[PDB]
Symmetry: D3
Subunit: 252 residues, 6 copies
């Protein structure tokens, strides 16, 4: 009866989350039972459509992590249907302006705070009769910062009341700045922009997150004060592990 990520924050610690681009419930449950506070299902850069995300949300909740979704797009009705299917965290890609951040916020709150349509199929089962009064706190929302334009507008994006903060998309950000879309990059201009976004989010009293490709980079981001760190995509981790097993098996 609490959003586990908001509980982390309320108790003074950051949240660490998993990241899934592979559809299915078995690895979703297995990873949720690890020491992840949340598991993000990626519906943008994956083949995961709504039909496949729906059972994954159930499996993550059963495993003991908060189910999050990184949506394909910042679309209110898409987001609302995910909320009613038991997504309790929303990360919306490519939020570039205050207006787009306001569009995200509008989907996450019932009237009068937002315009979310009422029919909370799975949240009513989880939270019971008192859901409506607490509905806003049960959901975490982050706008993604992935472009030069979003950087230009970062302070105005952070002024939006109905979202908890921002989540950096570091490979899109590097690419829009004219650099290789490398995860966990050392490119100075990108590193400086990421630091800037974190600094402005905290100056605004908001939360800031970042996508990480490795556990070591995630540790550094937590030390730098990021509130929400993801590490690392299931497909990337699986591919790297398989490569190493093969190398070990085929070595002389």
């Amino acid at each position: 009866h609490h959003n586990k990520v908001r509980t982390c924050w309320n108790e003074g610690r950051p949240a660490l989350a998993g990241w899934l681009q592979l559809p299915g419930t078995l690895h979703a449950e297995a990873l949720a039972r690890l020491d992840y506070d949340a598991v993000v299902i990626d519906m943008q850069h994956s083949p995961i459509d709504f039909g496949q995300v729906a059972p994954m949300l159930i499996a993550i909740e059963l495993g003991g992590a908060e189910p999050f979704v990184r949506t394909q797009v910042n679309d209110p009705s898409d987001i609302m249907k995910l909320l009613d299917a038991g997504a309790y965290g929303i990360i919306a890609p490519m939020v570039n302006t205050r207006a787009e951040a306001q569009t995200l916020a509008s989907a996450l709150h019932y009237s009068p705070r937002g315009l979310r349509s009422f029919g909370p199929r799975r949240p009513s089962l989880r939270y019971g009769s008192g859901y409506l009064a607490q509905a806003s706190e049960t959901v975490v929302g982050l706008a993604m910062i992935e472009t030069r334009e979003a950087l230009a507008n970062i302070d105005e994006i952070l002024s939006v009341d109905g979202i908890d903060g921002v989540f950096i998309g570091p490979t899109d950000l590097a690419l829009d700045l004219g650099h290789a879309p490398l995860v966990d990059t050392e490119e100075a201009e990108v590193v400086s922009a990421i630091a800037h976004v974190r600094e402005r989010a905290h100056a605004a009293g908001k939360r800031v997150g970042i996508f990480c490709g490795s556990g070591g980079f995630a540790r550094v981001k937590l030390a730098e004060g990021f509130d929400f760190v993801t590490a690392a995509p299931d497909l990337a981790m699986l591919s790297a592990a398989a490569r190493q097993v093969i190398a070990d098996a085929r070595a002389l």
Copy 2:
């Protein structure tokens, strides 16, 4: 226009294969593009049903590995439908007697050698008009040895003409012998039984394979002369990788 595992054998080398318990096509293709000769899809100890295996076979072939299936049971009609869907290797669990091995063989060959029903939807597309004359060589078949009874009958199982050899199921074998079902075990009685099965398979001029849980154990099995080694399940590798990322991320 060749079964990649049979090509390994024909050219004097063993085959290394992947092992999938997670449904879906994206990791199947990704792992098939690694230096695996084959990828086995587990339909016994997984939630992978026929509807989910079918596109995975396509994805593995596109990635450049031979699609194999470890079936739920040694059932001829199940096996035939997988063959016609483009499974080119069959590993049948719990083959305990010569008769059961003969049942496996019967499904893998058209008349007069076997009783496989003719309607090769996907193999005809892959191999073209000359498929029938070469159909038997396009498929690899292994009977699993997983019980004290299968050990008792190993020589008679190895005498069956229509199968390429046997594949050890080491956790079921350890359990039936009264030991912990530990993968890559050091338990002497199990280690001795595995060695015995390999020795009898090669005395019979047949192939022998084994399921491995690690790249290091797989390397040792290849050095011991196993013809077909799998390493390691996608879910196990992914879970271990995620555990390590979390440990690294949460370390001081």
Copy 3:
């Protein structure tokens, strides 16, 4: 070769419809064979995506009710794809302005009346060669009225030619007015607003519908003159029935 709801209206009677939030074809067919003129599939507050709605439309038609869909959003291309899959009634949520009602209408009619794209896969099978000339009459369209803004604009919404009328969303309406989102509510301000919408729809010569949570409330709405009444969601009815069976079974 007639839309059953339009036939009700043409013959001077209202239509009663079912309401499905559970995916699947078996209960869809079973409920369609009851004395429902139509069955509405809810794609907003449910886990029903396009892949799951498509066979349900077939099952409802076979059962003998008109297949309707309450869409996730008022989006023209979404609506068109449902029409071509054999949805013959469209209820679009959150229609708040005349322009949005015009957007709904545009999707329901071929040129010159609307901009519906031509490729009527399933309607051509149902209606045969003369489909195009009769296509508009085969589809029923209702804009949902669920907000204070929609109330403010009700007369302008009702002036839109290409829609049959409006459908009240009473729990969203109550919530936007600052009241509990209770179905079949007695809250005076909500009751008055619902009556007002009905009165203006009929003053405009248009149809008006309402979502009901019980058979008794639906009877009263029919007596008040509503043209299209739904009662009641499959999940709600099933949950209530199960609760009662358990209470009866566990009673002393």
Copy 4:
């Protein structure tokens, strides 16, 4: 970390279970959150195949009831794959002889007690490292008694060690005795046979269950001492509720 039905029995009370013939996770979770100790998913007289049962098992567990399956057939490998997918109760239809009951038992226990193949994907996640030592107690197994032949063999069926008892299929039983396949029947010969099966099960120190079509009949069966009572199928309850809503809505 306990099978909820076995906990009922261990604490001196019978278990009441739901019964699902409709695929999908939403009503499965909703009904599991009611005062059902278990929810049985029917894979015999339904369109529920393995691909659809798998997420339902997750949803039932999350809702707080023990997931049970009534299988299509008494087949060991089918049953094992369901166990590894997190079915913790198995009801096998048409068990007519002691040998068939022994076949059921064989699938529910690891060696040496049975021949269940080891690879417990979801039970290992639920129960953790100590699963193997407790695996047998985590699963409940009932053989169905549905024919004159099963009646003839009831004492020998009840002598089988690896099953918890029997579950009466009352409509098949009535039909094989030459009577209408009416649920909750009053036909004396059927009523007498049901009573006889219960009496012999308890004389054997075993559990006995029965399928019920109503809460009132279920109450009587509990009073008669049945250990496991199901009431009532989702589709039947939903259809009856819809019929009544329509009757109420269309009444003058």
Copy 5:
């Protein structure tokens, strides 16, 4: 309220049926609306599993043809689940002996005639309260004759009461006789065997069918007196049509 194939026979004419190896409902409905009396869904030499056949049965019935299934295997519980999903014709492959034909018959009739388990989800919806009394006539059953052994046993197979007759599998038959598995073959030994099976079926007062690859061969088979002729597989017809469109498009 009649099986359309049995109606053909009762009115003195043969039945012509379609044959589907491609999953999906749209072409199933489209072909059922043509002058086919039935449409057979092939679950043996196709990727069509139960989850995909279920909506296809609905679509065929809506289109106006009798839904038939050629099963993967002659298995009673598989067949029963298809019957309860609304398959009204069963063609079982590889029926080689009288006993196997008796196994087929057992699944198609309730007690006392057979052992079919009672729970007719979709047939009860189609036929209503009087279903049980007429259930046997609503289903057509054919045993496939595809081997030298089935030829050897043809008279004993035809003596089985609970099946309507036999259905020749001509490519498997040619292959088992040592000839190319060519559809619509002219190979004298195969042609003679097919004629023999037809002659013995009619001498027995039973029905005989055959799989055809072309409309011209089907016409000849109807002239020869076959009672049930299929022509031709969706995939084969589609592939041939596409080849011709390409040839026409690319011609000078």
Copy 6:
């Protein structure tokens, strides 16, 4: 490591493509292995949703044709998710203005040329490490011209840099001009408009394509200089073939 349609163009020849409205992988692979340079999957006038298109893209690539998609709508995030799933050609319906064409172009190119979000799951597997530098050339994009408005704006649409040209939707075009939506029409006003669009595309140095319903019309369009011709929809070809088989089978 080349887009097959762009290779046609680079080598001085047009491309011929298939057109699929039926979901599934088997006919997709079979048709891709014919002498089609590409196969277009129709997600507008079909029941093919994202979950069903994803494996079809794999099957088309394996068969040896370039996978194309005609999307439901010109939506950037939809298009991007298809690109990352291995759609290498995009045909967007109802592009009526230069701005809408600019929206299409924006989705097909990474920064700085467009705003495509980076996460190319399947293209990175196909093309390897050098994908980013060549990404734009790997994708073909065509805006559809289907309305009087698109005709009015054809020169401005053709001036858009990030698209390869236009694709005529001839049945929607005929309908918007007030004529029957007949494929391969002879209606002079439609024929003249189609010719005009081709002439302006080539005057602009751009590519032009057209949807065809027959191989003979496609041959004429290729002779007229169209760069991209599709012929003909799987469902239409299959339906026509089945009609002819039935006519041949039922003829005296």
